[PDB]
């Protein structure tokens, strides 16, 4: 999911 990639990048930070 493209919201998931956002989610994960957001998580990493």
Locate tokens 């989610």: which residue?
Answer: 7
Which backbone phi and psi does 2 adopt, to 5 degrees? -80, -15
Q: How far apart are the first and last CA of the chain?
A: 19
Structure tokens at 10: 């957001």
Q: What is the DSSP string of 1-13?
A: -HHHHHHHHHHH-
Asked how this structure was determined, the answer is NMR
Round to whole Å and give the CA distance between 1 and 13.
19
Round to whole Å and give the CA distance between 9 and 7.
6
């Amino acid at each position: 999911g493209i919201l998931d990639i956002k989610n994960k990048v957001s998580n990493l930070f």
